[PDB]
C-alpha cells in the first residue's frame, strides 16, 4: 500500500522472545514526508514520491530548492517513488512511520549490497564485470520487532543493505 525508505543501522543475531538468538536486521524508520502525488490525468499514472532525511542546503541547488518549495517540504537525501494502492489518496506534507506494517508479516525489502570492485574472471566466474551494488528483490520476509518508539524496523534474517546505504521496505503481496 505505502512503503518506507531508510537506512541499515546494523544486522545482528538478537535473542527471541523465547530466548533464542535469531538473526534480525536493524533498519531505522525515518519520517518520510509526502512531496508529490501523481495523477492519471496530468502524468498518466497515480503514485506518490516522497523524501527521507534532511540534507544541508549547500548540496541542494536552487532549482531543486524551488522544486521542494513546490512540494512544500524541506530537501532531503533524495526522492523515492511508491505505487499507490489505487484507492485512497494521501496529502502532501504529512510523514508516515512503521505504524500499520505490523499487520502482514510478509513485507518485502529492497536495497543495495557490499561495495565490491570489478573482480577477475577466476574469482567471479571460476568475462570481467561487477557483483553487488545492485538493487535487491529478496521477498517473503517476516517482521520481528515493530517498536515505533525507537523508529527501528526489524525483520527476520538479513537485509540487502550496505553500512549506511539507502533501502526501502514495502508491503509486498508475493510470498
Amino acid at each position: 500500500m505505502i512503503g518506507l525508505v531508510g537506512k541499515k543501522v546494523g544486522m545482528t543475531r538478537i535473542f527471541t522472545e523465547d530466548g533464542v538468538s535469531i538473526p534480525v536486521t536493524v533498519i531505522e524508520v525515518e519520517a518520510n514526508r509526502v512531496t508529490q502525488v501523481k495523477d492519471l490525468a496530468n502524468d498518466g499514472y497515480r503514485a506518490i514520491q516522497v523524501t527521507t532525511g534532511a540534507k544541508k542546503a549547500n548540496r541542494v541547488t536552487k532549482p531543486e530548492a524551488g522544486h521542494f518549495a513546490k512540494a512544500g517540504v524541506e530537501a532531503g537525501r533524495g526522492l523515492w517513488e511508491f505505487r499507490l494502492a489505487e484507492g485512497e489518496e494521501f496529502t502532501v506534507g504529512q510523514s508516515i512511520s512503521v505504524e500499520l506494517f505490523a499487520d502482514v508479516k510478509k513485507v518485502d525489502v529492497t536495497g543495495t549490497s557490499k561495495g565490491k570492485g570489478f573482480a577477475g574472471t577466476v574469482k567471479r566466474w571460476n568475462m570481467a564485470g561487477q557483483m553487488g551494488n545492485e538493487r535487491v528483490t529478496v521477498q517473503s520476509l517476516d517482521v520481528v520487532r515493530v517498536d515505533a518508539e525507537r523508529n527501528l524496523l526489524l525483520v527476520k534474517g538479513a537485509v540487502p543493505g550496505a553500512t549506511g546505504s539507502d533501502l526501502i521496505v514495502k508491503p509486498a503481496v508475493k510470498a
Binding site: 557490499k114 561495495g115 565490491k116 570492485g117
Partner: protein, 120 residues
C-alpha cells in the same frame, strides 16, 4: 579490498617499509622539515603524528617505546622535552604539508612537510 582500507599499499617488503618509515620520521624530526612525495608524505604524517601525540606524556614506558620505534638516542633525548611543551595547547595536526610541483627527473610530485609552529 579497495573499500574501507586505511594506509596506501606502497608495494614493498613489510620490514623494509617499516624501516623506511622509521628512517623518514627520524630525518624529518631531526631537520624539522622534509621534502617527500605526496603518496609517501601522507603516510609519513599518519605514522609520525602518533609519536608526537604520545610524546606529550613523559614516562619511562613512553620513553622506552619512543626509543624502540626510533632507535636514535639524540632523537629520544630531544623528544618529550621540546615538542611536548611547544604544542601543549594544540591537540592534533602538529604538522602541515604544502605541495611543491613535481620533480623534473622522474615527474615525481613533491611536498614539504613541516611543523605548524616551524620555529620558536
Amino acid at each position: 579490498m579497495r573499500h574501507r582500507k586505511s594506509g596506501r599499499q606502497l608495494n614493498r617488503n613489510s620490514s623494509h617499509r617499516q624501516a623506511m618509515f622509521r628512517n623518514m620520521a627520524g630525518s624529518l624530526v631531526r631537520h624539522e622539515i622534509i621534502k617527500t612525495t605526496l603518496p609517501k608524505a601522507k603516510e609519513l604524517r599518519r605514522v609520525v603524528e602518533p609519536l608526537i601525540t604520545l610524546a606529550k606524556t613523559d614516562s619511562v614506558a613512553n620513553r622506552r617505546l619512543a626509543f624502540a620505534r626510533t632507535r636514535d638516542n639524540e632523537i629520544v633525548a630531544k623528544l618529550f622535552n621540546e615538542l611536548g611543551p611547544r604544542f601543549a595547547s594544540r591537540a592534533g595536526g602538529y604538522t602541515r604539508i604544502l605541495k611543491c610541483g613535481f620533480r623534473a627527473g622522474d615527474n615525481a610530485p613533491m611536498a614539504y612537510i613541516e611543523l605548524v609552529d616551524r620555529s620558536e
